[PDB]
Amino acid sequence: RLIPATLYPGRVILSLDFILFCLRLMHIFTISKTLGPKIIIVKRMMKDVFFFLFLLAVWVVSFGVAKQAILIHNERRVDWLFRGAVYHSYLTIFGQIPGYIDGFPEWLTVLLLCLYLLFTNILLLNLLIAMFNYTFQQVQEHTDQIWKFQRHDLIEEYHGRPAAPPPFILLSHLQLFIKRVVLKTPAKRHKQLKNKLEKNEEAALLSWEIYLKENYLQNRQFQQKQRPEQKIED
Amino acid sequence: FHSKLQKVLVEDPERPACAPAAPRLQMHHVAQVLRELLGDFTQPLYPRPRHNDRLRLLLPVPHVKLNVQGVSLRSLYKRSSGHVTFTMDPIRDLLIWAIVQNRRELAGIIWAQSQDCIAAALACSKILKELSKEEEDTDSSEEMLALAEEYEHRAIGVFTECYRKDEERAQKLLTRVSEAWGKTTCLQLALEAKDMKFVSHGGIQAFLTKVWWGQLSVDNGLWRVTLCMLAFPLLLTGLISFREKRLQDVGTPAARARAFFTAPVVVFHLNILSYFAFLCLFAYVLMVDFQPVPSWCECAIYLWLFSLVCEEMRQLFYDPDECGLMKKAALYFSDFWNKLDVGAILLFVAGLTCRLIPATLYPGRVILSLDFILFCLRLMHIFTISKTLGPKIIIVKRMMKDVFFFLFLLAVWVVSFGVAKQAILIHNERRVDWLFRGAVYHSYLTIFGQIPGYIDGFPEWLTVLLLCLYLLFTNILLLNLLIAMFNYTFQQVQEHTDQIWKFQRHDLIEEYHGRPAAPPPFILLSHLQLFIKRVVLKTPAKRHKQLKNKLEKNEEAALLSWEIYLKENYLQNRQFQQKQRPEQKIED
Amino acid sequence: DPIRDLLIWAIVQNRRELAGIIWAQSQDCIAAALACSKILKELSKEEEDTDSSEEMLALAEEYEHRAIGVFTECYRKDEERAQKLLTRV
Ligand SMILES: [Ca+2]
């Protein structure tokens, strides 16, 4: 975007770079309870899509040249040779058989229309259905609970942030980095909401939890005895 | 089985192969029908040929000296075979007689003193799985399905005992000839009985990861193994080390080279690269160098593909024994991926002649374009490598084997649209041969939503509706059948069909590690390493590709006594959890 | 702490019920049950190869279930002290 010789990739690369922020955008907007778990469904999808990229990138290539093997078209100049044989022939997977261009055994491509159409839908879009059949377990009942597990995992990451905005966080960096030159060793206000334990505070607590543990100790063996399978074992 | 033997007694009566007589029940008659109850095995425990020929012992034809009758060892002829005492193994034979009489628990007692600790349980699992499928028709065939899985589970706990203590001897245990069960190397039986829980048992997966390497062990990554493939001095850096180089035994660059050839993956990763480059230059010669004279690239496009015809031929040399020709080819034309390997060369017979005959140069480009798809089928069959990759290609086996009419169902359903849409109007983008083309090809290009805007660019409510009517049973009849055909492959998917991928994994790795490391342009030199070896020799006994284990008899007795000692060490353990079953105690 | 160390020596010898008896006098009422749940989940995944690794998957979920009923006891009575309980050093 700054070198004048490559200003076309100044718009092209940063357009692709916007997609990489869009990935984190979904990663940061997966907030609520109905929202959350299915972004993780498209983790185990998308971690498995990493070849379904290349499987697509294998499967597309055998179509557009083969369709233009019927005829090498004429919407074409010296550098639209390598473009028209490729880019017009491989824009066609949004159903976009290039009407831009034109606008003896002819039974073959009538069939070959469906032959590629078959294992688009069979090989890639039953694999839509098949890759769903890896994330098929404890879905409403317990993977929704796995959302609550990763929820506070992220909330401690994102409540553990200074409240200054990113244009005002360099001032908060200057609240800490030139604090290091008037101090020596890092002992400043670190972000933590922990609990410091007085030893007399512990003994009032931990004796009661152990007293609750013996209060639970009779209760855990009780339902072991209240198990009717124990009684027929008795 | 007894109804089979009386049929076998008239499948081999007096006339065809027992020329004096055979109306009465003999051992080889049971062995021949035990031979169909095995597959790729040898013939154990029940010796068949002229040294124990139990086929003709009913009418007087003379003894040992003339070899035409009997066993040629027992020097007395009294209408039997004498006291051929304990022919190979008595207890292994009682495993047969209980299961062919369907004696369930007593064969497990015969298992408790069976010398074959492991593969005999698969032998009680394999035929009983066939007898599940062959004939009981109800109430026992379903039961011996549930019995063979416990008989498989009998074989699992044997490997539990041997692998947890001195696994080095248990490493050999899956490679023995063992002189007992037609050697079968203990995996070729395990690959035949389909053994869905047995081959996915734990330390076996720890063991097949040691078959996965040799002198080329772990701490090598998938990204950095390809960097040492193309770059030969990069292998000599601080990157990938051998077991020799770990022990500092690489003192020769040829030893750094020749051990690199012997990998299960380096041969395979050359088939990743050098095979796929033939598919890419295929488009380059087709777009540009379509010239009917043999050019420098047209001479180059033959150097890879005819050698690939010889690769499956070289695989066909690795198929048979030293006696079989037509049956091993008959097994080759039964596998569906090997049925798809026909057309990839078949249209290259037709389309290349079209590429050379000037009168048919348009099919010289059309047929070979369709022939590229047939290599694409094998391309998916060869790139279905990794664990996340593998099982769903087999999902689109039971899809695609069921798609074989969904081709024609599509080929029924499309046809009723495009003529019917052009029944509204027969269009005008048309000449004398675009009549048959414009009424068909423009009207049947329309299933990529491609209602032909090329062409144009009283109850009109009907096709407004008929737009949706065809659209309905495209999505209803064919694309709920998308959902419906998924509902045949719906069982044990993440948990156990993924284990079925591990089952077919080493099935393929023994096929593809069992290859010479020469590339297909250099394999004709390796054919000349073998075929003009046949003219300086006489009989095939050269270096055959096999990683088996030869068993010294004193080596066996140190091993097999310990496995039997481990079997009695397991024998108390199997009955213990039967007693530790609480349902046994309320039965007590 | 001696009793917290006997929780290790039973599980690294795969002693199932005796560690639960060591749990019955374990001073760490809550996080020790997760400590018998965490490493036993690794030892499920690391190496037993059959018949116990699957069992200690089914044991760690009860060892997790051991830790659940501890929070059942503390939160239902004086949850204010149980509010601190998830923040102690
Ligand atoms: Ca093959």
Side-chain angles (χ1 to χ4, degrees):
Chain A
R1 192 257 181 275
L2 264 295
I3 290 170
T6 55
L7 289 174
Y8 291 103
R11 168 159 188 119
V12 167
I13 296 172
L14 296 176
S15 66
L16 295 176
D17 186 67
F18 182 76
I19 305 158
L20 297 171
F21 288 104
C22 199
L23 311 166
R24 188 179 181 271
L25 195 69
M26 177 180 70
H27 180 71
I28 203 165
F29 287 172
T30 175
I31 177 66
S32 176
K33 60 96 176 177
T34 58
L35 312 181
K38 277 174 198 311
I39 284 93
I40 308 301
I41 295 301
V42 310
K43 283 299 290 295
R44 294 293 176 92
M45 232 37 93
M46 180 176 67
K47 287 318 265 181
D48 220 48
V49 163
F50 184 74
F51 191 73
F52 184 72
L53 294 70
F54 188 72
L55 178 64
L56 217 12
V58 168
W59 180 251
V60 187
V61 185
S62 160
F63 175 68
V65 190
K67 184 178 71 176
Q68 297 292 319
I70 305 167
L71 56 92
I72 297 169
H73 63 88
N74 291 319
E75 194 266 329
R76 182 180 61 84
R77 296 296 188 272
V78 58
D79 203 5
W80 285 264
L81 175 61
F82 187 75
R83 182 178 182 269
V86 176
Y87 179 70
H88 291 286
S89 62
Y90 290 103
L91 173 80
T92 69
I93 321 298
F94 288 162
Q96 192 63 40
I97 310 300
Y100 297 99
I101 298 299
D102 291 332
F104 181 75
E106 294 293 326
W107 60 271
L108 207 134
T109 325
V110 167
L111 189 74
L112 206 38
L113 176 72
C114 314
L115 295 177
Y116 184 73
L117 178 60
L118 188 63
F119 289 100
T120 49
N121 292 323
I122 297 300
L123 191 149
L124 305 168
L125 200 143
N126 284 105
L127 198 150
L128 177 84
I129 316 163
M131 201 185 284
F132 187 57
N133 207 354
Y134 265 14
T135 64
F136 65 97
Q137 299 175 358
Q138 60 176 11
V139 284
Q140 188 177 3
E141 294 87 6
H142 300 284
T143 69
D144 187 75
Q145 306 191 331
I146 294 170
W147 174 73
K148 304 33 193 210
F149 179 76
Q150 295 292 324
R151 180 176 198 256
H152 188 270
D153 197 4
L154 287 188
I155 298 305
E156 164 173 28
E157 181 180 1
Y158 289 108
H159 180 269
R161 297 181 293 174
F168 289 162
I169 203 166
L170 285 187
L171 280 175
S172 292
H173 286 293
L174 288 175
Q175 287 179 356
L176 305 181
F177 282 110
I178 69 172
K179 187 184 281 186
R180 293 177 183 268
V181 302
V182 299
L183 311 166
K184 167 67 199 85
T185 287
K188 52 199 178 300
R189 302 300 185 273
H190 56 86
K191 177 59 187 182
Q192 197 165 11
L193 66 159
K194 59 157 289 194
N195 180 24
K196 177 55 216 168
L197 267 298
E198 184 181 1
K199 308 310 145 201
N200 298 309
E201 162 202 3
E202 293 155 357
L205 291 157
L206 69 93
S207 46
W208 176 64
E209 328 302 327
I210 288 171
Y211 162 69
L212 290 174
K213 193 195 80 190
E214 289 107 16
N215 196 15
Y216 186 49
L217 194 56
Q218 320 126 327
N219 303 324
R220 185 157 281 261
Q221 54 93 20
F222 180 54
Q223 293 304 313
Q224 178 56 254
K225 297 303 186 280
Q226 283 308 306
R227 168 172 68 103
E229 287 86 4
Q230 177 68 54
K231 296 188 182 56
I232 53 184
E233 279 162 347
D234 289 330
Chain B
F1 190 84
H2 181 74
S3 63
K4 288 181 59 50
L5 263 297
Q6 202 42 65
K7 173 202 61 54
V8 168
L9 281 195
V10 292
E11 288 326 296
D12 215 345
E14 308 214 18
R15 68 223 192 213
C18 317
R24 284 90 173 189
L25 203 79
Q26 297 197 353
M27 180 268 291
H28 194 187
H29 289 263
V30 192
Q32 277 140 353
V33 77
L34 276 172
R35 192 260 172 273
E36 61 93 21
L37 293 169
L38 54 89
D40 47 27
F41 294 69
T42 320
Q43 295 133 2
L45 303 170
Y46 276 5
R48 305 166 189 252
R50 315 155 302 180
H51 281 293
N52 189 209
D53 200 9
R54 165 64 158 176
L55 281 181
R56 291 168 172 86
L57 292 158
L58 189 147
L59 294 157
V61 281
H63 75 109
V64 169
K65 302 319 184 218
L66 282 146
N67 190 250
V68 308
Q69 170 82 310
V71 312
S72 80
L73 314 157
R74 305 271 302 112
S75 182
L76 55 99
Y77 183 47
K78 205 43 77 158
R79 78 262 188 192
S80 315
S81 157
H83 193 256
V84 194
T85 171
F86 305 132
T87 169
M88 195 156 312
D89 293 298
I91 310 297
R92 289 176 171 78
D93 298 330
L94 315 178
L95 292 161
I96 305 142
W97 196 76
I99 299 308
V100 306
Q101 292 196 330
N102 278 339
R103 314 209 176 275
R104 170 198 73 85
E105 194 51 55
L106 308 97
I109 313 300
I110 295 162
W111 162 79
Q113 60 260 6
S114 286
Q115 298 82 230
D116 186 22
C117 303
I118 176 69
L122 291 84
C124 312
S125 313
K126 187 221 174 154
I127 295 95
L128 182 87
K129 193 192 278 193
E130 312 168 47
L131 184 46
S132 316
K133 298 185 298 291
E134 278 153 329
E135 181 39 65
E136 290 297 323
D137 264 328
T138 190
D139 286 330
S140 42
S141 44
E142 302 92 290
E143 209 283 325
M144 62 188 63
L145 290 167
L147 194 55
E149 60 89 19
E150 200 271 337
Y151 280 14
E152 174 172 11
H153 155 63
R154 290 185 15 291
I156 303 163
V158 189
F159 190 73
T160 302
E161 185 70 26
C162 76
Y163 192 77
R164 286 185 65 88
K165 294 153 303 307
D166 206 325
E167 50 265 16
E168 279 288 322
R169 303 166 82 178
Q171 277 164 13
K172 323 185 59 50
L173 175 142
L174 284 307
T175 53
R176 268 74 169 272
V177 283
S178 81
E179 272 63 63
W181 288 92
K183 318 296 185 294
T184 331
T185 202
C186 177
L187 264 300
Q188 200 180 4
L189 154 69
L191 267 294
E192 192 167 328
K194 191 257 176 185
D195 288 333
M196 184 252 304
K197 287 76 69 175
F198 184 55
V199 196
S200 62
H201 177 206
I204 297 282
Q205 276 53 44
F207 170 67
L208 63 95
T209 51
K210 93 159 272 206
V211 204
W212 184 244
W213 296 121
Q215 321 286 338
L216 289 142
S217 298
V218 209
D219 204 76
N220 182 20
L222 273 172
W223 60 273
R224 43 181 177 170
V225 61
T226 77
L227 303 168
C228 289
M229 187 63 69
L230 290 187
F232 182 74
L234 188 61
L235 183 62
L236 320 158
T237 62
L239 207 56
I240 304 167
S241 178
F242 290 176
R243 193 185 69 83
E244 293 178 354
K245 188 177 180 180
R246 187 180 296 274
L247 297 174
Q248 297 297 320
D249 306 309
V250 180
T252 302
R256 193 66 187 268
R258 291 179 180 178
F260 183 74
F261 284 113
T262 59
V265 296
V266 166
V267 193
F268 180 72
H269 287 293
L270 287 170
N271 291 119
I272 295 293
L273 318 159
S274 62
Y275 180 75
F276 183 73
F278 181 76
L279 276 77
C280 297
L281 188 61
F282 174 95
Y284 184 75
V285 71
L286 173 75
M287 292 182 286
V288 175
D289 203 358
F290 184 74
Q291 299 295 321
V293 295
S295 80
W296 184 255
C297 297
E298 184 67 28
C299 308
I301 208 70
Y302 294 162
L303 296 172
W304 183 263
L305 188 55
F306 191 73
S307 66
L308 271 272
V309 179
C310 292
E311 295 293 331
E312 289 289 327
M313 182 181 71
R314 191 262 308 155
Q315 181 178 357
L316 193 145
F317 289 115
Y318 289 165
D319 196 5
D321 54 350
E322 314 173 326
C323 299
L325 291 174
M326 294 299 290
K327 292 181 182 179
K328 299 290 186 182
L331 272 308
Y332 189 76
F333 289 105
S334 48
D335 294 331
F336 180 69
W337 287 109
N338 291 318
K339 288 181 182 180
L340 297 173
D341 290 341
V342 190
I345 309 167
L346 188 70
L347 299 178
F348 185 69
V349 175
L352 187 73
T353 56
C354 290
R355 192 257 181 275
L356 264 296
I357 290 170
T360 55
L361 289 174
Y362 291 103
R365 168 159 188 119
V366 167
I367 296 172
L368 296 176
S369 66
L370 295 176
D371 186 67
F372 182 76
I373 305 158
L374 297 171
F375 288 104
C376 199
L377 311 166
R378 188 179 181 271
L379 195 69
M380 177 180 70
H381 180 71
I382 203 165
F383 287 172
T384 175
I385 177 66
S386 176
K387 60 96 176 177
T388 58
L389 312 181
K392 277 174 198 311
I393 284 93
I394 308 301
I395 295 301
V396 310
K397 283 299 290 295
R398 294 293 176 92
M399 232 37 93
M400 180 176 67
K401 287 318 265 181
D402 220 48
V403 163
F404 184 74
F405 191 73
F406 184 72
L407 294 70
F408 188 72
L409 178 64
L410 218 12
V412 168
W413 180 251
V414 187
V415 185
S416 160
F417 175 68
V419 190
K421 184 178 71 176
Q422 297 292 319
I424 305 167
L425 56 92
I426 297 169
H427 63 88
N428 291 318
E429 194 266 329
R430 182 180 61 84
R431 296 296 188 272
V432 58
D433 203 5
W434 285 264
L435 175 61
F436 187 75
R437 182 178 182 269
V440 176
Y441 179 70
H442 291 286
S443 62
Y444 290 103
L445 173 80
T446 69
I447 321 298
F448 288 162
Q450 192 63 40
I451 310 300
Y454 297 99
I455 298 299
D456 291 332
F458 181 75
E460 294 293 326
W461 60 271
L462 207 134
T463 325
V464 167
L465 189 74
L466 206 38
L467 176 72
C468 314
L469 295 177
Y470 184 73
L471 178 61
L472 188 63
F473 289 100
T474 49
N475 292 323
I476 297 300
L477 191 149
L478 305 168
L479 200 143
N480 284 104
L481 198 150
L482 177 84
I483 316 163
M485 201 185 284
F486 187 57
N487 207 354
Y488 265 14
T489 64
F490 65 97
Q491 299 175 358
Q492 60 176 11
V493 284
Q494 188 177 3
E495 294 87 6
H496 300 284
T497 69
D498 187 75
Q499 306 191 331
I500 294 170
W501 174 73
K502 304 33 193 210
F503 179 76
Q504 295 291 324
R505 180 176 198 256
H506 188 270
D507 197 4
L508 287 188
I509 298 305
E510 164 173 28
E511 181 180 1
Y512 289 108
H513 180 270
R515 297 181 293 174
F522 289 162
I523 203 166
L524 284 188
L525 280 175
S526 292
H527 286 293
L528 288 175
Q529 287 179 356
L530 305 181
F531 282 110
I532 69 172
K533 187 184 281 186
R534 293 177 183 268
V535 302
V536 299
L537 311 166
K538 167 67 199 85
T539 287
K542 52 199 178 300
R543 302 300 185 273
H544 56 86
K545 177 59 187 182
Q546 197 165 11
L547 65 159
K548 59 157 289 194
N549 180 24
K550 177 55 216 168
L551 267 298
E552 184 181 1
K553 308 310 145 201
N554 298 309
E555 162 202 3
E556 293 155 357
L559 291 157
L560 69 93
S561 46
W562 176 64
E563 328 302 327
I564 288 171
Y565 162 69
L566 290 174
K567 193 195 80 190
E568 289 107 16
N569 196 15
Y570 186 49
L571 194 56
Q572 320 126 327
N573 303 324
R574 185 157 281 261
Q575 54 93 20
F576 180 54
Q577 293 304 313
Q578 178 56 254
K579 298 303 186 280
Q580 283 308 306
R581 168 172 69 103
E583 287 86 4
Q584 177 68 54
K585 296 188 182 56
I586 53 184
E587 279 162 347
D588 289 330
Chain C
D1 293 298
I3 310 297
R4 289 176 171 78
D5 298 330
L6 315 178
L7 292 161
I8 305 142
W9 196 76
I11 299 308
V12 306
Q13 292 196 330
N14 278 340
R15 314 209 176 275
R16 171 198 73 85
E17 194 51 55
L18 308 97
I21 312 300
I22 295 162
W23 162 79
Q25 60 260 6
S26 286
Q27 298 82 230
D28 186 22
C29 303
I30 176 69
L34 291 84
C36 312
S37 313
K38 187 221 174 154
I39 295 95
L40 182 87
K41 193 192 278 193
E42 312 168 47
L43 184 46
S44 316
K45 298 185 298 291
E46 278 153 329
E47 181 39 65
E48 290 296 323
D49 264 328
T50 190
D51 286 330
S52 42
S53 44
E54 302 92 290
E55 209 283 325
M56 62 188 63
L57 290 167
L59 194 56
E61 60 89 18
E62 200 271 337
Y63 280 14
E64 174 172 11
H65 155 63
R66 290 185 15 291
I68 303 163
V70 189
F71 190 73
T72 302
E73 185 70 26
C74 76
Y75 192 77
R76 286 185 65 88
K77 294 153 303 307
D78 206 325
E79 50 265 16
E80 279 288 322
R81 303 166 82 178
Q83 277 164 13
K84 323 185 59 50
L85 175 142
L86 284 307
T87 53
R88 268 74 169 272
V89 282

